[model samples]
Target: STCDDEPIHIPGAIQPHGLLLALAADMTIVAGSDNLPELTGLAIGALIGRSAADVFDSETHNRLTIALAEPGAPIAVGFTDAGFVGSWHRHDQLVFLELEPPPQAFFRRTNSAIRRLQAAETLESACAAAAQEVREITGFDRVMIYRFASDFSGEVIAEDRCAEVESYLGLHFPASDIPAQARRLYTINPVRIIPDINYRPVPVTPDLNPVTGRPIDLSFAILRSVSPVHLEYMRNIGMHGTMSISILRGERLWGLIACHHRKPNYVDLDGRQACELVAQVLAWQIGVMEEQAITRQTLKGQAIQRSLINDIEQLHDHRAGLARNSEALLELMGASGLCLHSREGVITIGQTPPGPIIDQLAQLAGRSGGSELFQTDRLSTIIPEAGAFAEVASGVLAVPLSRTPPRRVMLWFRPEVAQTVYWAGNPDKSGRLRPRTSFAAWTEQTHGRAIAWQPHEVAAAVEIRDLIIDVIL
Candidate 1:
């Protein structure tokens, strides 16, 4: 299949560890995995189109109904007459029932895991704790906290694994590694586990919902067969089993707690639930840490803003006033150089392009847009003329002090810091669905850019621009 045409949602089959049954609104089984006989002691032919009562006793069926009415977390409905633990959910007028053997000593172990996560003080520490905790619970060879960038690419920020397992720390993956549709599904379903990548998928009987005449929506099915492309990608990495837990920041998909096993492994429903809960607690802690960091930056910016205003009033000359506070402005945003342009002349400090280049940059900022603040890390890409000055002034942050003609501007410069990024494999080969024979690191060298401006830096620029406008106008 073409890369864009991979049938991710409609696999029509499932992994064999558990039994998956799709039921109609009235509690009749419309479709089931072929392994139903081995799991529930009833043949697939007899189970299909029969009432759920045929398989589950009245007490268990009643418990399922109550659980489905207010579904939040997966609820264990105890062992069935066939000696398997039952779990169920209701979605889109269809019922999904899964059965597996009960996990031993789950409550004690899960409680201990929750306590470990609650002790984290920082987001980084929290992620590290989660990786370690999950590895212990699931017995996976490796676990990582993979964070997504603005471009949808991902980086393995934290990792824990056995000594024998190859390290994936700090490895980056291109956005194409996970298609757009897959990311959307991650948001809808918080947990996905593939117990064994090599297992043949058992096709769902009928292959379509009898009532809807369309493929059953198996978005939340635990045993739902995965995309073949992804399976091949995993095989390339020498992984046999994998699990992922979504980390959400409000409604947005933030990152993932990813687990990988070198050999086939299965995590029971109880263990999967424990890992999911830990991720939830870690997400809340991450939010707290992020808000605290922003608060500190905001306070620092406000203090610098006041100092600039005071120094400007005392000096009485716009150019001289800013020049006296140049160091403070540079330190406020962590820029390497500063330039203040006004009707008097241009004042340049620290490492920056020559006076002529500064004049050309001022002109570029004026013509680019009339926004109060203009910023870009890749100056050469936008201004082409800035290519010559890329080494010393790859990033430019400018704020216009006046809206009137002969615009006075304040510009900050960050020198280019070349980067070498490491990827697990060639991103260009993502569309092939063929296993990469080697796991050697792929290196990408980046130049003609500096660190992008943070939100706090931009806020400080706007405040300074407002103060300058008030003092001069």
Candidate 2:
């Protein structure tokens, strides 16, 4: 959790590329970036009492006020003759005006990239194309599709880069690389651009809001500065510039389109927006591909369910029917083993835990809470005794046969395979929160878990359990 303890939101600084201004209800500038004197020809001292209306042209002033009326979305308005483009963010009555110079080609690339991405028929191809497209749009030396795993760690599943730059495709990264709080912010901000990793952070004059008296919360500001630990991370990786666009699926942070360059680089607002658009389009296509696979899997489960139902009802005995077609039942969930626990005894069709171990599993499945379904990839997490049998049943999926304190149940299991996680660097940093200096490959062998279960597999199990319940003794 040390990785998340940094108060990154109220960092009290902004990236030097942009100038920031915090204005009050009456449009009086309360706080601004220290570099304001260099960029705006006015120091924070001179700007503090001045109204926002005094700093911008009358046309720009009226346009921005009307734009802020729409609520939280930061709208980028017309270009300012003052060497920067303007955007506005509001918190209560306080308005945050962020200004950064415009990038000097974006719409054409975005439209063409969207069209090219549409032609991908699978997740892998789509991701590869996305890496290529984002790199082209942002002009980064390398672009990677970093996908998050169930454990919060991530893998670079796809990459596009110049032949000279190092390739990170297929390499895994530890969860610590991106702290928990950083991931939380990704859900709200679609894109983050660190044009120069070595640039000094400009302090916000006054540091505290004149009224709120608290550090400025730039959680949603475009010019919000990032943590030094994060900057150190880039430095360790030999990156001079960086940018990432969040890819959200089902309203959750799914992954990121990460870009890097060896030399300081800048992607103007338009170029950054294009990368954001590509991220969305890429996420959309991935969603479609995943949904299609689930539907196909569900349909196959239906066929298996129909056959099982016919066999059980014809015999008027669930055990006899299920035992007769054990192979199909096993294949239904791709389980290494299957078991049916009843008053008579445990009938195992394949490689399950010893008889007594199955009994403990049944008791846990029908414990006081008595849920209808029980599932776990690491059974020992709920009952330590399960560790002894984890080699064969580390992952378990069970469905109670009845609604109340069911005495009978069906279970499926898979063996724990030796999982080799290829991390970009040693993940075990017991003392340091900073990124490790070396990024060479470090492979670690992880144990005590199976391949894990999928939603479609769980659905198939439920379907079979429900159908078999029709003839339960």
Candidate 3:
């Protein structure tokens, strides 16, 4: 019983500690070790877990002491500085870490998973299978596959949900929510998990400066204390906590496996290790598949790039390939429907909005001045006429097609039914009332802001992205 109830370790070193030593060579890609522009030499050593302080008898001797003086803060410190704007966390056996890029092992594992997915014939099949695998591996409440447009607009391409959880399939998110800036940040780092928005801060010892008795520069980490902004955002959107693993092809943010929990919960370091390993394998597999798909589909890399180019290419007929490519993308991502738009006109295809509505949206696009991903619901006042989409539609993701492409845009629709279907295996049952209503309410209260997700489900959705890029790009 004690074994079953014991607390977890942080940054669990897998089977053998030697694995870390081996991984150190590849750490630069995963940990951003090379670009620690703000970290002092002393701070860098501490980050690598180097006990250099002991040997040097330098300020680094005290981890807390060194932290107080550092000008650059850890991701955690940044959040604190931002007025508790939000919170993001990941459970490692060692300590709960703020959102940051993963290590090399993370990418390695994702690649392997992608290989496993490639054996499947279709993106839909691969994604469905991968999602189930992710659910099983991560042991989270739900895992949804999200793909991003060039402009940062995104769609929930696939999902795997627990029996007790509700699905958010077909539920589209606004592009502005992630923003081009955020997407750029995400590309550099491939994973982000906010374990519990309400978790108490684990205080470090006061800072000590060796040269100067006063505290040095540690505002970066200290300032990034969990912000209340994210907490309220989660509450507003019906999610208590999130574990989002970025899916990248080299430096590109291909998509993400967003794990959601309805309440506060913890993913032990061991669980995180397991998930990270799996995520790496998946990414590698997807990368290989995408490469293959690109090779097979076009003569030049630029051609493929143009196909998946930003949201605005539609403003010009020369960009017709985008529409053709969009169909392929839909099939690859395993979405029931897909849509593309530009400041000039809007195009709808696959499992998406009706022709008249899409045309109306296109007409509205002409009226709308700027370009960017816009979630219709979030901007209800700006576009009151778009109210018909409410409820029936969870949201609209609008992305500016290009910087110079006028106000061109792309919109993705996510229906409530799709969100529910991914979890329940049927869209119609997404919000079905459970028998034990009181128990469900109690469960929500006790759980706080953590959600459990199944690894298999995540694997399935990720696999879809992999296959799409590989076979059909």
- State the C-alpha lDDT per candidate: 0.78, 0.79, 0.44
Error of 1 at 51 (Å): 1.0
Candidate 2 weakest ten by summed lDDT: 71-80
lDDT of 3 by residue, 1-473 (tens): 12122112111111110011111221221121222323334333344544323322233234323443432223222221221111122212111122232166644555465565767555555666567667766667888877665556566777888897876765445444454434554565555556666644432222222323333222212112233444455665566767767677677787777888787655544445556555565666666665556544333333444454443344444335555566655433333344655444656665555554554555555344443324432323344544454433334444444444354545554443312111212222213222111111111111111111112222323332343335343
Error of 3 at 181 (Å): 5.1
Candidate 3: stretches off by over 4 Å: 1-115, 202-226, 291-473
Query: TM-score of predicted model 3?
Result: 0.40
lDDT of 3: 0.44
Ordered by TM-score, highest first, the candidates read 2, 1, 3
Q: Which runs in model 1 stand beyond 4 Å of their true positions? A: 39-42, 69-83, 103-122, 299-306, 317-319, 339-374, 398-411, 462-473
lDDT (Cα, 0-100) at 99 in candidate 2: 80
- Model 3, residue 23: C-alpha shift (Å): 22
| Inter-residue clash pairs, candidate 2 | none
Stretches of candidate 2 off by over 4 Å are: 71-83, 103-108, 343-345, 355-359, 366-373, 380-382, 430-432, 469-473
Question: TM-scores across all candidates?
Answer: 0.85, 0.90, 0.40
TM-score between candidate 2 and the true structure:
0.90
Return the top candidate by lDDT: 2
lDDT for model 1: 0.78
